[PDB]
């Protein structure tokens, strides 16, 4: 449930707000019951011709003034206590939530993603804040007033309520089928559209290939296709809902028809009084269209429940391994033993691949063992599974031979300390930085163990020696200063087991020896299993190890390994956009807006029309000198019918036409944004802000909010304005006195709403600041989770958050108070205005100035009119929402990328010469521009050769290709394509002429046959020519078994095909494009050696004639590869 987070006084805030909202609502119907006392008595005065006239009139006045004070107190106790309970619930939601996220496992952390987390937290919450803030208040008031029409009709005159009641159920059916068909459609619409979304997700999911083969366009059309079906049923549901509302109003009007004629009979029976009836009309009118004019508030609550859903999914959760409980044993006497056990473990993200498949190790307390070999063999997969980040799927790890699952982890991850693989820092001082060892470290406890890594010169050197700031990832340091604070930092825990893992690799070997030997003699009783760098600093371990593919069979001491011929004898050898640009994105479809607005003025001004209906009704009702009822009022029952059918047509029109305007804009802009994105350079997506999920939300939610402005603004604001204005006209017309005075409220409500909107936007601003501060904290852990668990210092982060979060808390307090104040002002002055002008108009009559019935028309025009400002400024928050979203997608539009993918001018080389040449090409990636890529590169291939490459693990071994396909402009050097340099190229041709094997080439939300066919757009390459290239890839002889030949929709990133198959295809994805320059980076990885060669085999008598660069770090087909380049920090060797 939403409210499930509420203390007692929370609930007292609520219930007092809700009963006072009931009284807020019951205000104006009872104002009409006294309308009726007044109408009866004073129409009998007017028609009959009462010198108490002024007396009685001011009496009724002070009655309405009493109700003025009544609605005042009601309004602001409503808003005060509603927003206050909302805010206290908000902060409690946030505390227990953020608690839960720090509590939910790392697994769950690699199934969701960070910016998606933080964005969920912030916007989810703020959504819930306005959801349950005060909207619920307006809604309970607005249903109160319509529901008070019920009893008021019955108590005042029990005649016409009979008939109108007796019509109510059939309207029950009207709105029944309303919700039935709206729900049916929109559910089918989402259940479909979510596919149009997932195809965007999977296409933007590997922008690499989607650019690496120009195949932008096939995917733009895939989008527009699923968007086609959804947009189709768009206008359909628009119809159904507007059909429904038109039915609703047809039936209200013909119901008033029955009522008016039936009760005409009654009043002409000289029975009861014009008061009872004419009220039972009026008191049953306001309530009804009001509770009608309630769509946005139930919109709000809908959004809010949808929000709170997944948040409570997060909160109520619980893992099998917990971070906040004494869930088991927690012993004192421990010798730092640790022994793996038949570990068969795999990720909860990349589940299918298993990394450790049975490892029978042995470590004792005090004795250190060395962890070395080749990369990927299991070092990090060894370190993570010890502090039980990822619950071993089938493996187990035990200290002293018992269940570490029963070792209370708040004790486990606090007794052992693994100085991180890559030293991560925080936006702290060096003091607090190390303090994250435990937290209570006196200055000496700091300095003494600080010096144990020589951190005393560059720390005692700075102005504010220690108290100067370690920056962003240590941005006020680098490796020569950073990796020192770490290896002594978590030391201050005095770990019962320290563990080293490539943790001293970024300085001079002096500091390395300091941290190594100062932690060689410091581990007198604690072991330290070492993943090291050098082949003599691996040896400071009583036993050395060998990492072999999930089986521990070879390991031991110095004289225990080198003589064994395993690995150890092998090893040593927001520029704001305008009102106009938003309003101009929808320019083609003007007539839909002209239609929407004309029908809007009709729908709106139709109410003071009802003032005139009922006003000339009063007079005709008065005398009855003839058989008036069935002779005239039959006509009026008709007019009600005519306005009923006119309302059906005008409603259905304005609603439907804005529905179709909404569809129009959404399809258009979704498509344009998707295209724009897929065009841009590669250097946009290789970032951390502009990710995949960030982008999917950007697209969907941003087009949605671009419509939310106009596609619902004109209609609602327009009902309101032409309504106020139609009453305005009427009032000015009859007696030009009462408008002005009853418009003496326009300055109060005007400047009040204005100061409230300005100081409420100011609230939004101070809030963005305060939660932006708070979210700095948030994001810190939310990103660095790998460490904030391992230091077991997440709970202080909890508390530091909470104290910051107090920020938008007191903000909310100010917000509740200023908002309550303003809207109390508004309501109370509306009522006070009725009373005062009412009064003055009494004596106006006692001139004769206005025929009474005219005053009642005037007052009644007003009392109808203003009932349209209920949420007239409630759709303002969504407008600034849209305006922001607009400036965002416009940053996404006009950005003229450096290297355009649609090269219009330049050279479109109609022939290919495979001569690429490098000479001293230097390059650095954009993300974190400290470290470089190359130390000057110079290489080249001729036609048909094989420039093979082999080296260590990840030393500039990816960036080979990405400089040739013109992703990036390599900083300073020579890169060209056969004399005519690349910068002359038409990258379209160039990109469609090369060939790449992706590092992990995905498949799409597509069949078997287009995936391959993808490789050549600008022309549909035919069905057959695949089977050759699919047999030349030795992948068609497999399609033998697949159920459909070529209609397998291999689900989101290859669901029905394994990776090896999703690699065994990779080659076929281009071959028909005729890639004359093969750039194979990790050509064949996931196959079997008999067929794994057919990647190259099937090519052996065909790779020739067309140049290439083949890079697959193996032995059987590099030893027959021509040219070699050794990767030594980015050179050619």
């Amino acid at each position, epitope marked *: 449930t939403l409210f499930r987070y509420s203390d007692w006084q929370d609930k007292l805030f609520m219930s007092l707000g809700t009963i006072m909202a009931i009284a807020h609502g019951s205000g104006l119907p009872l104002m009409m019951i006294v309308f009726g006392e007044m109408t009866d008595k004073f129409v009998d005065t007017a028609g009959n011709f009462g010198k108490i006239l002024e007396e009685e009139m001011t009496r009724y006045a002070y009655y309405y003034s009493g109700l003025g004070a009544g609605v005042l107190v009601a309004a602001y106790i409503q808003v005060s206590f509603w927003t206050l309970a909302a805010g206290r619930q908000i902060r409690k939601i946030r505390q227990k939530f953020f608690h839960a996220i720090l509590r939910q496992e790392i697994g769950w952390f690699d199934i969701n993603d960070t910016t998606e987390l933080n964005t969920r937290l912030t916007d989810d919450i703020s959504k819930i804040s306005e959801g349950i803030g005060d909207k619920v208040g307006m809604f309970f008031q607005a249903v109160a007033t319509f529901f008070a029409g019920f009893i008021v009709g019955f108590i005042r005159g029990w005649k016409l309520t009979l008939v109108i009641m007796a019509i109510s159920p059939i309207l029950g059916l009207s709105a029944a089928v309303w919700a039935k068909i709206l729900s049916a459609f929109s559910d089918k619409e989402l259940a479909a559209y979510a596919k149009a979304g997932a195809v965007a997700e999977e296409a933007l999911g590997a922008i690499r290939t989607v650019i690496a083969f120009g195949g932008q366009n096939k995917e733009l059309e895939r989008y527009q296709k699923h968007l086609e079906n959804a947009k189709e049923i768009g206008i359909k549901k628009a119809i159904s809902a507007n059909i429904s509302m038109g039915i609703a109003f047809l039936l209200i009007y013909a119901s008033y028809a029955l009522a008016f004629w039936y009760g005409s009979t009654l009043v002409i029976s000289k029975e009861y009084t014009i008061g009872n009836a004419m009220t039972v009309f009026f008191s049953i009118l306001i309530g009804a269209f009001s509770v009608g004019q309630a769509a946005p508030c139930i919109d709000a609550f809908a959004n809010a429940r949808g929000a709170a859903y997944v948040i409570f999914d997060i909160i109520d959760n619980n893992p099998k391994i917990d971070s906040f409980s004494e869930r088991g044993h927690k012993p004192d006497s421990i010798k730092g033993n640790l022994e793996f056990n038949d570990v068969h473990f795999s990720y909860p993200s990349r589940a299918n691949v298993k990394i450790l498949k049975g490892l029978n190790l042995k470590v004792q307390s005090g004795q250190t063992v060395a962890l070395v070999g080749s990369s990927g063999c299991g070092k990090s997969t060894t370190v993570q599974l010890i502090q039980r980040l990822y619950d071993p799927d089938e493996g187990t790890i035990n200290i002293d031979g018992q269940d570490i699952r029963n070792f209370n982890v708040n004790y486990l991850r606090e007794i052992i300390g693994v100085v991180s693989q890559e030293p991560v820092l925080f936006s702290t001082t060096i003091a607090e930085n190390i303090c994250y060892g435990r937290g209570n470290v006196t200055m000496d406890e700091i300095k003494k163990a600080v010096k144990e890594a020589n951190a005393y010169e560059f720390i005692m050197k700075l102005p504010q020696k220690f108290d100067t700031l370690v920056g962003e990832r240590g941005a006020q340091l680098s490796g020569g200063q950073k990796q020192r604070i770490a290896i002594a930092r978590a030391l201050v825990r005095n770990p019962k087991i320290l563990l080293l893992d490539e943790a001293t690799s970024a300085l001079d070997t002096e500091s390395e020896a300091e941290v190594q030997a100062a932690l060689d003699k410091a581990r007198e009783g604690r072991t330290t299993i070492v993943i090291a760098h050098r082949l003599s600093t691996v040896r400071n371990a009583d036993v050395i190890a060998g990492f072999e593919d999930g089986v521990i069979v070879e390991q031991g001491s110095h004289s225990e390994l080198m003589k064994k011929e395993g690995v150890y004898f092998k090893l040593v050898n927001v520029p*704001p*956009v*305008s009102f*106009l*640009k938003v309003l101009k994105l929808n320019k083609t479809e003007w007539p839909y807006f002209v239609v929407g607005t004309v029908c809007a003025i009709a729908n709106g001004g139709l109410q003071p029309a009802f003032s005139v209906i009922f006003s000339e009704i009063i007079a005709i009702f008065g005398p009855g000198d003839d058989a008036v009822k069935q002779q005239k009022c039959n006509i009026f029952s008709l007019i009600f019918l005519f306005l009923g059918i006119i309302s059906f047509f005008t409603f259905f029109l304005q609603g439907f036409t804005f529905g179709k305007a909404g569809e129009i804009l959404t399809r258009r802009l979704r498509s344009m944004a998707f295209k724009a994105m897929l065009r841009q350079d590669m250097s946009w997506f290789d970032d951390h802000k502009n990710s995949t999920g960030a982008l999917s939300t950007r697209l969907a939610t941003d087009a949605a909010q671009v419509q939310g402005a106009t596609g619902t603004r004109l209609a609602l604001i327009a009902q309101n304005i032409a309504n106020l204005g139609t009453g305005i006209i009427i009032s000015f017309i009859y007696g030009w006195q009462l408008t002005l005075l009853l418009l003496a409220v326009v300055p109060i409500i005007a400047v009040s709403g204005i100061v409230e909107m300005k100081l409420l936007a100011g609230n939004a601003k101070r809030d963005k600041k305060e939660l932006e501060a708070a979210g700095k904290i948030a994001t810190e852990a939310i990103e660095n989770i790998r460490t904030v668990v391992s230091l077991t210092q997440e709970r202080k982060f909890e508390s530091m958050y909470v104290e910051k979060l107090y920020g938008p808390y007191r903000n909310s307090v100010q917000k509740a108070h200023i908002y309550g104040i303003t809207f109390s002002i508004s309501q109370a002055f509306m009522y006070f205005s009725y009373a005062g002008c009412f009064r003055f108009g009494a004596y106006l009559i006692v001139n004769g100035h206005m025929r009474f019935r005219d005053v009642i028309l005037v007052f009644s025009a007003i009392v109808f009119g203003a009932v349209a400002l209920g949420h007239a400024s409630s759709f303002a928050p969504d407008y600034a929402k849209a305006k922001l979203s607009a400036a965002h997608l416009f940053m996404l539009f*006009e950005r003229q990328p450096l290297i355009d993918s649609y090269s219009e*001018e330049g050279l479109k080389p109609d022939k290919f010469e495979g001569n690429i040449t490098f000479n001293e090409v230097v390059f650095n990636y954009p993300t974190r521009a400290n470290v470089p890529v190359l130390q000057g590169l110079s290489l080249e291939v001729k036609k048909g050769q094989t420039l093979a490459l082999v080296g260590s693990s990840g030393c500039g071994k990816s960036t080979v290709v990405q400089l040739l396909e013109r992703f990036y402009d390599p900083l300073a050097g020579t890169v060209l394509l056969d004399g005519q340099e690349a910068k002359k190229l038409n990258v379209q041709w160039l990109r469609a002429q090369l060939g790449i094997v992706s590092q992990e080439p995905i498949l799409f939300d597509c069949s078997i046959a287009e995936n391959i066919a993808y490789g050549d757009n600008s022309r549909v390459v035919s069905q057959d020519e695949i089977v050759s290239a699919a047999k030349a890839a030795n992948i068609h002889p497999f399609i033998e078994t697949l159920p459909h030949k070529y209609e397998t929709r291999v689900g989101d990133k290859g669901t029905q095909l394994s990776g090896g198959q999703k690699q065994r295809i990779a080659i076929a994805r281009a071959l028909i494009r005729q890639p004359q320059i093969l750039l194979l980076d990790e050509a064949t990885s996931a196959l079997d050696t008999e067929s794994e060669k057919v990647v190259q085999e099937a090519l052996d008598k065909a790779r020739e004639g067309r140049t290439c660069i083949v890079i697959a770090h193996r032995l059987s087909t590099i030893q027959n590869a021509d040219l070699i380049v050794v990767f030594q920090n980015g050179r050619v060797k």
Partner: antibody
Amino acid sequence: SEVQLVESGGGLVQPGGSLRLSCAASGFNLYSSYIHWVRQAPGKGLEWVAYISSYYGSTSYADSVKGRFTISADTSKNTAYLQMNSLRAEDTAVYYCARSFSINGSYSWWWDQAAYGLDYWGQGTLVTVSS
Amino acid sequence: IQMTQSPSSLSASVGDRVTITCRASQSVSSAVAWYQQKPGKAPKLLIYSASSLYSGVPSRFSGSRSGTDFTLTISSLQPEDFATYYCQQGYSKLITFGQGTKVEIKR
């Protein structure tokens, strides 16, 4: 700081050849006030060309080229880009990046477009059209 | 919407009333301009609206307005004068510049 209009690209082209004339309006940003494209006849004088205001999306080409001179005013890398299409012969004029006015100093309204003259100018790449 | 350059190639002597009288078209309606480009440069701005001058400019550029007439006199003619002048229009969605004009020395 102050307005700096630094111009790049273009100049050698055959009639019927495309280009991009680019103006880094660095020191301020493309989105406060207008940005035109002055024309400098080769020994005869001046002419106004075209202009975009990117806080209204409101763009304008020139009469004798409308369809060959696409403007864009990129606000993220703060540079004006003129897609020149085919740049016919008798357009060897100098093209200066021009700034429009600020009756206050901060920004430019849309109504009464550029009424108070071009209170900032720049120095562009003289373009020429020959074979 | 257009311009007419009357003051062509006026080479009067320093220290005398040298008048630039460039007439616009019908109802540009108070949008005159008189800019200075020294030979081989981009034009400066010297005056707008024929009522106000650019800050940091000498006060010898006096423009008198009569309907379709903006008449700007220079009286001192420093060595910073004797440079190219231009009259141009900004109004009604469009802006137009005129061919080169210039004040010179009299010998």
